[PDB]
């Protein structure tokens, strides 16, 4: 009777970009509520025992979260299924390994070891800039990190290098034309490159014509456009599969290569 919200979640009718299997396990990790909307989010337990595969059972991953070896956004995590969204660093506190959650142009999460220089700041394109009560301006980013006292020259869609040690925002990068933007969603997922064009409509439904690095020019809406810094200026490393765009006849030339070429 749907007498309250579902507190359960099973597999395959699950997001495919998490790269889960078929009905081999009849339940999903089911990420918690938090900073990002639930489909953007990625459970730790998929990244731990299904991507890095240091564990094999769930009660270990609970105890690994009781080991508290996991710092997402520089903040101590004991959640097996933490709602971590985009450009979220994951500090594996025992192996000394930082990994920032960014998407590929193939369509998969990138196990992507950024430098620890790049782990202190993550670039959050802002969600709102609001004059709160008693006349106080604010910035709140897409991970809902309510930050008082913004910058006095920023406007909408500016990217803040979010100090993951503190919050309490550091320097910004203004929303500018031609910025590097990892285009995410639809047929343009994981595509980085300059903007070069934006289209506006009163009301809703604005498209953004993006020409990426490979030369694929495409008009895909600003919801699909997450700015990651400045044009021809990345701020973390580029993910696997080049993070721009790949063709499938070339991808067989990719998939034939390092299998039986290593060790």
């Amino acid at each position: 009777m749907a007498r309250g919200p579902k507190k359960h979640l099973k597999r395959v009718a699950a997001p495919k970009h998490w790269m889960l299997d078929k009905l081999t396990s009849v339940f999903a990790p089911r990420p918690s509520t938090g900073p990002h909307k639930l489909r953007e989010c990625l459970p730790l337990i998929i990244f731990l025992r299904n991507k890095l595969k240091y564990a094999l059972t769930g009660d270990e991953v609970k105890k690994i979260c009781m080991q508290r070896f996991i710092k997402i956004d520089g903040k101590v995590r004991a959640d097996i299924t933490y709602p971590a969204g985009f450009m979220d660093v994951i500090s594996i506190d025992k192996t000394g390994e930082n990994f920032r959650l960014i998407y590929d142009t193939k369509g998969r999460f990138a196990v992507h070891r950024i430098t620890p220089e790049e782990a202190k700041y993550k670039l959050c394109k802002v969600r709102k800039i609001f004059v709160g009560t008693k006349g106080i301006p604010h910035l709140v980013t897409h991970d809902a990190r309510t930050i008082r006292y913004p910058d006095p020259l920023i406007k909408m869609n500016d990217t803040i290098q979010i100090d993951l040690e503190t919050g309490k925002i550091t320097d910004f990068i203004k929303f500018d034309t031609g910025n590097l933007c990892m285009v995410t969603g639809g047929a343009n997922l994981g595509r980085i490159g300059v903007i070069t064009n934006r289209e506006r409509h009163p009301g809703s439904f604005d498209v953004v014509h993006v020409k990426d690095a490979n030369g694929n020019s495409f008009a895909t809406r600003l919801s699909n456009i997450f700015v990651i810094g400045k044009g021809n200026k990345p701020w973390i490393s580029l993910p696997r599969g080049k993070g721009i765009r790949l063709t499938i006849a070339e991808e067989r030339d990719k998939r034939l290569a390092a299998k039986q070429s290593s060790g």
């Binding site: 078929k22 009905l23 063709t247 499938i248 006849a249 067989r252």
Partner: protein, 182 residues
């Protein structure tokens, strides 16, 4: 979860010319029944139409190329098709028996310890051969090019080299109890 049939049924029940034509392929290649005829008959109708549809596609289509060059390669990695022709016109010209020769059974009859294709199905079924480090028990196995280069005696066939089971021992018991008088 998901299953399918690997054989096929024609819409004509008794077409005796076909029914004795199917008796040929069993007798020419060593098959179990008409299902082993109908198994490759189930495949080859799809193979020609997949060759037909890619032929009717516009050229320089990746769904024509990248699927098709796989389908070119998949038909050549098993060695049924040769890629010296390598176009959809000739893939419309393939047949059942090109696969039957690339089965494990006939290659045992072509190469190795098979005197008959009755005998050639037996050597797979009674596991006298290893096609790899692999006791392979399936006669409808259809092989690849490299697969025809490692078919040996099995190490569970105690004749031609192998650990004794109970049979060469029984054949020893034919001389050590069949001739040992107990």
């Amino acid at each position: 979860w998901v299953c399918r049939k690997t054989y096929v049924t024609p819409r004509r029940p008794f077409e005796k010319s076909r029914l004795d034509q199917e008796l040929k392929l069993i007798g020419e290649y060593g098959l179990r029944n008409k299902r082993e005829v109908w198994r490759v008959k189930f495949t080859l109708a799809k193979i020609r139409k997949a060759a037909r549809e890619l032929l009717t596609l516009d050229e320089k289509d990746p769904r024509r190329l990248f699927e098709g060059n796989a389908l070119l390669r998949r038909l050549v990695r098993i060695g049924v098709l040769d890629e010296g022709k390598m176009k959809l016109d000739y893939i419309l010209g393939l047949k059942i028996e090109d696969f039957l020769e690339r089965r494990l059974q006939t290659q045992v009859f072509k190469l190795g310890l098979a005197k008959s294709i009755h005998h050639a199905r037996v050597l797979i079924r009674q596991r006298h051969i290893r096609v790899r480090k692999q006791v392979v028990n399936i006669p409808s196995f259809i092989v690849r090019l490299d697969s025809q280069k490692h078919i040996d005696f099995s190490l569970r066939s105690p004749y031609g080299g192998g650990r004794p089971g109970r049979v060469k021992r029984k054949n020893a018991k034919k001389g050590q109890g069949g001739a040992g008088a107990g």
